[PDB]
Design a protein around this ligand. Structure first.
Ligand SMILES: O=C(O)CCC(=O)C(=O)O
Ligand SMILES: [Fe+2]
Length: 350
């Protein structure tokens, strides 16, 4: 409804050029803060022209049951796309409706859009989800967002501890961003499992809340665990996607364990972790045999990953986690091997 007074993000949010946004760039900073890229050149995307409209979204997706958020009544419902488009172009919208969950990769719209290059290089699903396995591949890579003026999504952490990119093709979005310190995470879990949670503005409860506007042609990358709300001050059309990566594995697991203690979720999160575990073990093995040392974040990440592996497979917890373990993973052997590799890197006597 109204935008107020927010703490300065000058020392927090990074604004590199598209070309500066590389893996090494992220590795040097740990992908700890949101990243706003003002111009799309260098990001490696493919996008429809800025003249591409919501009317064209209906064309490629089909007049499709899409999930719609009733902002005004704070509730979730379903609509045909043609009905939403019709609503979107009405000069007398009675209510405030928001579409944020239209995943379009299995539709015709999918070949008009290519996601940022950094995302595809980092993404666990993209690179490490196997062709052949009993599980369904998680499909959370291409979303079409259609937000009317005065749309609002309250403070949340993205499902599965994912990181996210958003490109605004038309209009504007304003993100309200809170760093996932242990304190803020505690306050968030407290706020999220509270009764009348949706009466209290979470940005009041915390040390610092940053506001970041994302205008036409701009691209925002939000890292793991960052608590964010979104206001749409002008009718908006945006594309975005969600991804897991190896830069802060502990934070991904922490976000996932919060989502568990509350209750919408990254499908087969634990499955991809198990496959990532096997891969990380190979990376450690390859580096030691090559007489090189792994980067610090990978040692820390493998450690956190191995802690979760043990927690998921201990006797009291196993019934809740067994269904997610791939049949090609020897749980005990992987835990043992990951632990040995990590101990070898860290033991001062070798
Ligand atoms: O665009 C919106 O209103 C919500 C974006 C967001 O933070 C999300 O979908 O996770
Ligand atoms: Fe989000």
């Amino acid at each position: 409804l109204r935008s107020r007074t927010f703490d300065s993000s000058d020392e927090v949010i990074l604004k590199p050029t598209g070309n500066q946004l590389t893996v090494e760039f992220l590795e040097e900073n740990s992908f700890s803060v949101p990243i706003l890229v003002l111009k799309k050149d260098g990001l490696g995307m493919t996008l429809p022209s800025p003249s591409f409209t919501v009317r064209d979204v209906e064309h490629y997706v089909g007049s499709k049951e899409i999930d719609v958020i009733d902002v005004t009544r704070q509730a979730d419902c379903k609509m045909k796309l043609g009905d939403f488009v019709k609503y979107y172009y009405s000069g007398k919208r009675e209510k405030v409706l928001n579409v944020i969950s239209l995943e379009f990769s299995d539709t015709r719209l999918s070949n008009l859009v290519e996601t940022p290059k950094i995302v595809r290089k980092l993404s666990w699903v993209e690179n490490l989800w196997p062709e052949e396995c009993v599980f369904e591949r998680p499909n959370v890579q291409k979303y079409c967002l259609m937000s009317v003026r005065d749309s609002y999504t309250d403070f949340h952490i993205d499902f599965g501890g994912t990181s996210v990119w958003y490109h605004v093709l038309k209009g504007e979005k304003i993100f309200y961003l809170i760093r996932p310190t242990n304190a803020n995470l505690t306050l968030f879990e407290c706020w999220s499992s509270s009764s009348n949670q949706n009466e209290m503005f979470f940005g009041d409860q915390v040390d610092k809340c940053y506001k970041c506007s994302v205008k036409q042609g701009q691209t925002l990358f939000i890292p793991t665990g960052w608590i964010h709300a979104v206001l749409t001050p002008v009718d908006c059309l945006a594309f975005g996607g969600n991804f897991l990566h190896s830069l802060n594995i502990e934070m991904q697991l922490k976000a996932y364990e919060i989502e568990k203690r509350l209750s919408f979720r990254f499908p087969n999160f634990e499955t991809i972790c198990w496959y990532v575990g096997k891969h990380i073990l190979d990376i450690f093995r390859g580096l030691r045999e090559n007489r090189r040392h792994p980067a610090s974040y990978l040692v820390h990440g493998g450690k956190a990953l191995n802690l979760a592996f043990r927690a998921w497979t201990r006797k009291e917890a196993l019934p809740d986690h067994e269904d997610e373990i791939p049949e090609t993973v020897r749980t005990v052997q992987l835990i043992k091997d990951l632990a040995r590799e990590i101990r070898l890197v860290e033991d001062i006597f070798q």
